[PDB]
Enzyme design. Structure first.
Site, PDB file in Angstrom:
ATOM      1  N   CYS A   5       0.825  -1.202   0.000  1.00 46.89           N
ATOM      2  CA  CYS A   5       0.000   0.000   0.000  1.00 46.89           C
ATOM      3  C   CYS A   5       0.862   1.256   0.000  1.00 46.89           C
ATOM      4  O   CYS A   5       1.352   1.684   1.045  1.00 46.89           O
ATOM      5  CB  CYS A   5      -0.930   0.004   1.215  1.00 46.89           C
ATOM      6  SG  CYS A   5      -2.607   0.580   0.857  1.00 46.89           S
ATOM      7  N   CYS A  51       0.139   3.755   2.879  1.00 46.48           N
ATOM      8  CA  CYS A  51       0.703   3.518   4.203  1.00 46.48           C
ATOM      9  C   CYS A  51       2.165   3.938   4.251  1.00 46.48           C
ATOM     10  O   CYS A  51       2.631   4.503   5.240  1.00 46.48           O
ATOM     11  CB  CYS A  51       0.570   2.042   4.584  1.00 46.48           C
ATOM     12  SG  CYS A  51       1.211   1.646   6.228  1.00 46.48           S
TER      13      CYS A  51
END
Length: 121
Positions: free
Chosen positions: A37, A40
């Protein structure tokens, strides 16, 4: 006694997220994420700086910055938006502040500070 070791923010997996992120001892900010991700990866700077400061400033025994792998750990809660940022206050661990997660620490402070009961701000 002993203080510090590795990683400031307490990355609590779904396995312990009910024990660390779901603890009423303090306001816990859980930021569901993944290893792939890119979001993140941009939210970590705030998680390490905020988390560290939250776990090494004047609230290390108070509101803590938690995390969890929504793709590596089977969470009991559903997630329509990946990633997610749920805030489990030290009183409202049943209706946290589910969020999407942004790339700003200022919003985080106001987060657990407006979302939190402890009002850590």
């Amino acid at each position: 006694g002993p203080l510090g070791s590795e990683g400031p923010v307490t990355v609590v997996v779904a396995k312990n997220y009910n024990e660390i992120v779901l603890d009423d001892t303090k306001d816990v900010l859980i930021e569901f994420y993944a290893p792939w991700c890119g979001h993140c990866k941009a939210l970590a700077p705030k998680y390490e700086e905020l988390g560290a400061l939250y776990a090494k400033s004047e609230f290390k025994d108070r509101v803590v910055i938690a995390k969890v792998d929504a793709t590596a750990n089977d969470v009991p809660d559903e997630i329509q938006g990946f990633p997610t940022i749920k805030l489990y206050p030290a009183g409202a661990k049943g209706q946290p502040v589910t969020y999407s997660g942004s790339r700003t620490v200022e919003d985080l402070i106001k987060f657990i500070a407006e979302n939190g009961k402890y009002k850590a701000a």
